[PDB]
Symmetry: C2
Subunit: 302 residues, 2 copies
């Protein structure tokens, strides 16, 4: 049984904090069942675990990659991810074939479906002698897309799916769907740094692409969404993007002049020397230039 990361980590805390097993029994929790849980044996109940994190004064958020369970799907995706990274492709293609069989015989699970698509997509993108076909990707893509369209709630993995779908680019990107996914995901407070990083990059890229497209109604739609996106006080990068978005709206609606844009852009270009290495600096600068050019064209061509 795989919840071993969690049990091992709880063990590490308990022992590091000098808490003897008897305390668990004094609180209504079988030290035996707990021990069997640490190993690879029997099954703990959530209420037991909650009593344990209160005993050990653990914040549950604190448990990070320890809250994720180590199922066949999760382990498979871990292997395939590192394999693809290190470019050891014989492994990646064999993990794919194995998982294809497992999935086709397994009970239905959205996680399994999503990981299945992920494996096919990354194979198609990175293994130059891949067996997986465009057609297999598209059929599975359309199943996931159909569920997304008919759904009323979205989670972070639906956003990852859309990002991956844009990179695969075998079918046009569902922009309207991106709006709905962003809205449902950002209804809750995101506390996963990894999720925040995905959401931020998607929003920055979405606004940049909207601008270069010079489609004003769409740019305004993206800006209106960015207006509702909540940014923490300490998230200076996102604060700055919010300020850029604000200044862009004024320019688009004729309520700011390009001389003011120019002053603002120069301030930014100076300030990012504090925060960014040189390559990131020039990439950012280039983004500002292309945005400036797009706006010049929009306002010249009315």
């Amino acid at each position: 049984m795989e919840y071993r990361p969690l049990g091992e980590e709880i063990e590490r805390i308990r022992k590091g904090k000098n808490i003897p097993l008897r305390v668990f029994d004094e609180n209504g929790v079988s030290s035996r069942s707990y021990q069997r849980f640490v190993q690879g044996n029997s099954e703990l109940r959530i209420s037991d675990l909650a009593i344990i994190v209160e005993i050990l004064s653990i914040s549950p958020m604190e448990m990070t990659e320890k809250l994720t369970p180590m199922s066949k799907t999760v382990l498979a995706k871990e292997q395939f991810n590192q394999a693809i990274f290190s470019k050891n492709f014989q492994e990646s293609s064999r993990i794919v074939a194995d998982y294809r069989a497992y999935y086709e015989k397994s009970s239905f699970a959205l996680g399994k479906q999503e990981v299945m698509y992920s494996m096919l997509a990354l194979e198609y993108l990175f293994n130059p002698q891949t067996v997986v076909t465009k057609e297999e990707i598209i059929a599975l893509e359309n199943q996931i897309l159909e569920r997304l369209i008919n759904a009323d709630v979205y989670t972070i993995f639906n956003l990852k799916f859309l990002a991956l779908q844009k990179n695969v680019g075998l079918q046009p990107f569902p922009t309207s769907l991106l709006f709905r996914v962003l809205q449902s995901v950002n209804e809750r407070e995101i506390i996963d740094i990894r999720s925040l990083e995905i959401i931020e990059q998607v929003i920055i890229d979405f606004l940049f692409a909207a601008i270069v497209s010079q489609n004003v109604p769409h740019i305004l739609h993206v800006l209106s969404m960015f207006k509702e996106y909540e940014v923490g006080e300490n998230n200076w990068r996102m604060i700055l993007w919010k300020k850029i978005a604000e200044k862009i709206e004024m320019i688009l609606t004729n309520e700011e002049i390009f001389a003011d844009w120019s002053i603002f852009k120069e301030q930014i270009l100076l300030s990012i020397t504090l925060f960014l290495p040189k390559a990131k600096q020039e990439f950012f600068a280039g983004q500002l230039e292309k945005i400036e050019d797009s706006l010049k064209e929009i306002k010249e061509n009315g």
Copy 2:
């Protein structure tokens, strides 16, 4: 015997996702999870097992992170701490003081848990700090404080709530601050990959306060210990605020080690002050500027003393 764990939020949230994703209860049974136990769980009845939950997050394609605050049970301790916090915030102090007295009784009769101990100290400390009509005495805060400190001295792993405890103990200031202990706690906590913005927010504020206080104290060996700690603290590329505090620490280092002069501080400070117009509202801008002012003055006193 064991205490009741209120878990309807978790069940209601899993319900929300399942229904929002068009997953019929039948699918849970195809995957090894008793739909009947699950429904009993969504209600106010029986206890779900960890393995059932794991299967459910795979069915629903959930990142377990995505729940976090629903994975926490509404225990007497959790509800009490939530209540007391918001009561203290809105300055409605009749509430806070009665939550305190109740919890003290509950804690004194309860079985032992470090969590209960920590919340107990949090409540006494915030009463004493914020309720100008508090019943809580110094001596009680001190007794409990010393129990928690003793456990901290004897431990070899620390968690984020130990850090919160140290920040709060410095604020209470009824006893000297254990600076060596703060170094060990920061070290142990930052051994993990902290993935939670909430913990990151507490750690960042502690180390910023730690460096500001070190400078204000003008005690150079201590300051140098804090700067080398800062130098080793890892921050993501997109954490611009922390990028900047690392650079501030770096510049302070150079002036103290005679590899840059006060003029270099002044140039750097003005560049920062121009940049923070982009990131900070006026109030945060002025607070930040004031911190740079007090740092500069301290640096000038140190350099005219040595």
